[PDB]
Design a protein around this ligand. Sequence first.
Ligand SMILES: CNC(=O)CCC(=O)N1CCC[C@H]1C(=O)N[C@@H]1COC(=O)c2ccccc2CSC[C@H](C(=O)N(C)C)NC1=O
Ligand SMILES: [Cl-]
Ligand code: NA
Length: 285
Amino acid sequence: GRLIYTAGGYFRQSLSYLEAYNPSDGTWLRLADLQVPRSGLAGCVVGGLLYAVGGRNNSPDGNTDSSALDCYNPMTNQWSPCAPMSVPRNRIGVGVIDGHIYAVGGSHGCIHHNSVERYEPERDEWHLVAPMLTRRIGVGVAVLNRLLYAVGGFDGTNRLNSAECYYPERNEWRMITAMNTIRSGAGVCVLHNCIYAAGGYDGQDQLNSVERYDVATATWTFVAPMKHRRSALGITVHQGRIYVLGGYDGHTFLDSVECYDPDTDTWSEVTRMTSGRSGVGVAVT
Ligand SMILES: CNC(=O)CCC(=O)N1CCC[C@H]1C(=O)N[C@@H]1COC(=O)c2ccccc2CSC[C@H](C(=O)N(C)C)NC1=O
Ligand SMILES: [Cl-]
Ligand code: NA
């Protein structure tokens, strides 16, 4: 029995919540709080351990971009600090290839990173890899065919509809087909050999449209939209279905959790988080 972990987020200030949803019995677990509150972070799982990467701590008295890597063990219910990244990355994208964590883009105050770095859990070390062709904050990352895809984001001047691809063996980035929609703060994931980009911000509105990349035909195609417009949403795949958690719709911080069935091309409300929040980090273990 695997669970959907939600870490951090934002509601009036950055949050410390770590909670797990069981899609089988519909229950939520309140787990050990993050040591430092964070929003705009990303979550991932390497060998049964959950990792919270980057983000920023917004508080009513000051804000602090994070370069932290923290590790939660479900067996112990304890967060342990890991080696920090070379630079702070708020609105980060994360991907795992061969049990290695790739920290993609993000911001550090005025800087919009195009730099990418890789964590080796076995050595507790980060090393920079080839940078992206474009600076991307609010970037969606997906691992497909042992390639690391950086999808959309914001380069400090424009919200991007562009997407690029990283070849770990070759240490290089190549531009792929751009999305039909400009999206910064989308939920990006892989389901049945397809990259799905759900929600986001086109620079005007928060989106509810969902589109998928088919590698064979190198084309992005729209699928059923979500019931709620959402940017800074959390996303994961669990038992052949996509789950989208919370987000921001232009005025409200959503508690809404939606599920996509690829077989029926329908979205349905599955549960509500214990409280509305945006900019969460999500993973399944
Ligand atoms: C459109 N305005 C922007 O971008 C910058 C302005 C902004 O919204 N700000 C400035 C300091 C606080 C921050 C904020 O309020 N962030 C929170 C937390 O977001 C995140 O983790 C996050 C994570 C990934 C991608 C993008 C985001 C931000 S989503 C935008 C949403 C928002 O529009 N409002 C006004 C509450 N914000 C928030 O949900
Ligand atoms: Cl933010
Ligand atoms: Na490709």
